[PDB]
Amino acid sequence: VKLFRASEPILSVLMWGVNHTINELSNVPVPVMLMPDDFKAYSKIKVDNHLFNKENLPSRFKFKEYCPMVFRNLRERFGIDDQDYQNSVTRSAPINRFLTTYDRRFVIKTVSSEDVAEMHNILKKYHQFIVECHGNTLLPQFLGMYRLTVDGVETYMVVTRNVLSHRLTVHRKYDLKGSTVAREASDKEKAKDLPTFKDNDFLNEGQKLHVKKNFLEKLKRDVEFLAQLKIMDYSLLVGIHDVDRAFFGPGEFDPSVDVYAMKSHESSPKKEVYFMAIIDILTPEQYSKRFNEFMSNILT
Amino acid sequence: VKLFRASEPILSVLMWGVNHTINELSNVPVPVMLMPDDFKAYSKIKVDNHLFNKENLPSRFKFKEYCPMVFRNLRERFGIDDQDYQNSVTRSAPINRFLTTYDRRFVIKTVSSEDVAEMHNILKKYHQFIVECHGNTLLPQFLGMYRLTVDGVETYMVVTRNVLSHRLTVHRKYDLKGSTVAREASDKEKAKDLPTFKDNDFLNEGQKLHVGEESKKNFLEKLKRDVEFLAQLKIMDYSLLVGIHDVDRAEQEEMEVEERAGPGEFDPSVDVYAMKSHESSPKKEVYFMAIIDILTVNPEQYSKRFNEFMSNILT
Ligand SMILES: O=c1[nH]cnc2c1ncn2[C@@H]1O[C@H](COP(=O)(O)OP(=O)(O)O)[C@@H](O)[C@H]1O
Ligand SMILES: O=c1[nH]cnc2c1ncn2[C@@H]1O[C@H](COP(=O)(O)OP(=O)(O)O)[C@@H](O)[C@H]1O
């Protein structure tokens, strides 16, 4: 019984809508492939109850899903079953603009109208690039994109698969950009429960990441693709888990789930698990090489 | 997997709507009591898809369900599972303004906005009546009420359980109102396949129904209670619907079907208006009898003439 009980009502609508749209899709056959119109399609639902079912939902709200068929296909190509996606969103309210599902499997990012337009401009090429990868890629894995309307105000959301592990506590996080600029953790951010250490502090800390080659074979392909689409401003996200810090076990992960995880070599000083993926690709060619250059020199 | 294919877009929308509201309702807990708000409540849904899922449904439609908690309670009080109700509407398109679900269990009547308003003004007394008679009534058993919007046009629909069996063929039917006036079926009507006969057609045929004492008296007690209730609401124009099933004729027809390649027994949990004919009766028959057309000569007077007529309708 899905009472859509959430820490605030926009999350109740998120849960209701993902539930609703995924059930509707279970009544829509999967095609022999996608058509152009699938890349221009949307679904729209306006809910207007009166004295009914108001305990957790609002009485009036809207939900819009951009390109349901394309995103259902992507979900398939990334190895995610729709009912799993549905349960990760609906079984308990998402948690903390960036959210995660209760099981930390997927992350929900608030985006702008500009970003939604940008994904529409990239979508057919993104999808064919993922067809040609057989999904073996470091780009964000886009699972769904929604517009919610609560109390008159529209909110746009993109759902991705999580870079970090949904089970293993992550001990240090870095947001690398490869720039010839000055990205460093702010003193306010440096005092966070878990800091986000941008580019400079990765070399001012001295962390290396020890292991090998298939990774760069995939990354070069990715950033070539992003530059060739005039995308800039993207970051690479690195997460460090210290096994030693510490049923189930330490350093133990499922690679079918934590798709980006990577075990450290025996030669590493500490026993570690790394997680690595590209993020924030909704906005040029120089940016590619510089960026690649930086990460060219993270691995040992 | 449910395509909702139907001969008309409105039926498709009806199937979608019953599916949607029943599944929504399954996420809503079943209340201890009903509250008064529940009798003014409604659920609205407005769909505008674009290049998406338009094989069977329209891109744009609306669906409204009246007092859904109240009709869910009613369903439960008439022994009808919600899951079953949605399957009868959604597994296959309803058929032939009157429709029936494919499995012939439920009847869907297009009605008027005034009918919806009348249902609203009587619903709370109707629900109390059903509660205090435990669903034992010849009145209509109302299961849902909806408003569909297709091509900018609203259509009101009331779902009821069938007076007629979902299995046993009906070979005669009468619509009796007890009126003093000459109710008779037209040449047009009397030329249909299953013509719907009226009062004087019933009398000129000298039809009488032998049900036996026990179920006769159950029927007459039910009917006294029901039409007293109706009269206390200023409701008229309602009829008794009687369908007659000829067991022997059904045996012959079914055998003629089998040749092209129990008997007279029914389930009273399902065919709740069904009565066997007395052990010592001329033909082995099964009747189905109920009150119909409830949303609208004094009302006390209509009650009186009606009851005195239907009292003599059977032996
Ligand atoms: O998939 C994720 N899992 C966990 N945290 C993430 C994930 N994606 C982004 N983050 C966190 O939120 C931050 C915002 O990243 P992003 O570059 O997409 O936002 P931006 O447009 O403000 O630059 C990341 O640097 C990191 O702190
Ligand atoms: O429950 C039913 N099962 C089978 N036929 C029905 C049922 N209800 C109504 N009918 C058919 O519809 C006819 C008219 O019904 P009703 O008197 O309620 O509508 P009205 O407002 O047009 O007079 C009935 O006399 C009968 O022919």
Domains of chain B, CATH where assigned: 9-161 (3.30.800.10), 172-312 (3.30.810.10)
Q: Is B208 a catalytic residue?
A: no
Q: Around Cβ B258, how many Cβ atoms within 10 Å?
A: 8
Q: Is B34 on the interface with A (CB under 8 A)?
A: no
Does residue B161 contact residue B269 with C-beta atoms inside 8 Å? Answer: no
How far apart (Å, rounded) are the C-alpha atoms in residues B313 and B210? 10
How far apart (Å, rounded) are the C-alpha atoms in residues A18 and B188? 54
Q: Nearest residue of A to residue B62 by CA position?
A: A46
How far apart (Å, rounded) are the C-alpha atoms in residues B275 and B265? 10
How far apart (Å, rounded) are the C-alpha atoms in residues B22 and B83? 8
Q: Around Cβ A263, how many Cβ atoms within 10 Å?
A: 15
- The residue type at A100: T
Q: Is B201 a catalytic residue?
A: no
Minimum CA distance residue for ligand 1 atom 11: A98
Beta-strand pair A235-242/A172-176 = antiparallel
Does residue A78 contact residue A3 with C-beta atoms inside 8 Å? Answer: no
Centroid of chain to Cα B191? 25
Angle between helices B82-90 and B9-26 (to 10 degrees): 160
Q: Which two tokens stand for residue A196?
A: 């986000």
Instruction: Calculate how close chain A gets to B106, using CA atoms only, in Å.
Output: 24
Does residue B150 contact residue B210 with C-beta atoms inside 8 Å? Answer: no
Q: Which of A180, A197, A218 is nearest to A294 (CA)?
A: A180
- Which one is catalytic: A125, A233, A254, A270? A233
Using CA atoms, how far residue B56 sits from A72, A280, B53, in Å, is 20, 38, 7
How far apart (Å, rounded) are the C-alpha atoms in residues B162 and B99? 11
Sign of CA dihedral B170, B76, B79, B238: negative
- As a dihedral over the C-alpha atoms of residue A240, residue A244, residue A248, residue A252, rounded to 10 degrees, the angle is 50
Count chain A–chain B contacts defined by CB atoms under 8 A.
77
Q: What is the resolution of this structure in A?
A: 2.8
**With 0-12 CB in 10 A as exposed, 13-18 as middle and 19+ as buried, what is B305?**
middle
How far apart (Å, rounded) are the C-alpha atoms in residues B103 and B92? 9
How far apart (Å, rounded) are the C-alpha atoms in residues A155 and B158? 38
Does residue A108 contact residue A101 with C-beta atoms inside 8 Å? Answer: yes
State the DSSP H helix or E strand holding residue B128, giving kind and residue range, or none if neither. Answer: helix B113-132
Q: Which of B67, B69, B103 is nearest to B86 (CA)?
A: B103
Which of A52, A61, A71 should we substitute to test contact with B (largest number of B Cβ atoms within 10 Å)? A52
Instruction: Calculate how close chain A gets to B37, using CA atoms only, in Å.
Output: 6
Q: What is the CA radius of gyration of chain B?
A: 21
Q: Which two tokens stand for residue B50?
A: 């674009």
Angle between helices A82-90 and A68-77 (to 10 degrees): 100
- The residue type at A140: P
- The alpha carbon of B211 and the centre of ligand 2 are apart by a number of angstroms equal to 23
Q: Around Cβ A108, how many Cβ atoms within 10 Å?
A: 23
State the DSSP H helix or E strand holding residue A174, giving kind and residue range, or none if neither. Answer: strand A172-176
How far apart (Å, rounded) are the C-alpha atoms in residues A53 and A13? 13
Q: Which two tokens stand for residue A49?
A: 């109850």
Q: Which of A88, A23, A4, A24 is nearest to B29 (CA)?
A: A4
How far apart (Å, rounded) are the C-alpha atoms in residues B118 and B112? 10
Q: Around Cβ B74, how many Cβ atoms within 10 Å?
A: 21
Mark out the alpha helices in B154-298 (DSSP H runs).
Answer: 187-190, 199-204, 213-231, 247-259
How far apart (Å, rounded) are the C-alpha atoms in residues A129 and A136? 10
State the DSSP H helix or E strand holding residue B305, giving kind and residue range, or none if neither. Answer: helix B299-312
Q: Which of B116, B40, B30, B39 is nearest to B70 (CA)?
A: B39
- Which one is catalytic: B40, B54, B224, B237? B237
In degrees, rounded to 5, the angle at the alpha carbon of residue B138 between the alpha carbons of residues B132 and B144 is 80
How far apart (Å, rounded) are the C-alpha atoms in residues A158 and A66? 10
Q: Which of A16, A18, A31, A17 is nearest to A73 (CA)?
A: A31
Instruction: Give the determination technique.
Output: X-ray
Does residue A276 contact residue A238 with C-beta atoms inside 8 Å? Answer: yes
Mark out the alpha helices in B37-81 (DSSP H runs).
Answer: 68-77
State the DSSP H helix or E strand holding residue A173, giving kind and residue range, or none if neither. Answer: strand A172-176
Q: Which residues are A241's β-sheet partners? A: A273
How far apart (Å, rounded) are the C-alpha atoms in residues A90 and A18? 7
Residue identified by tokens 């032996």 is B315
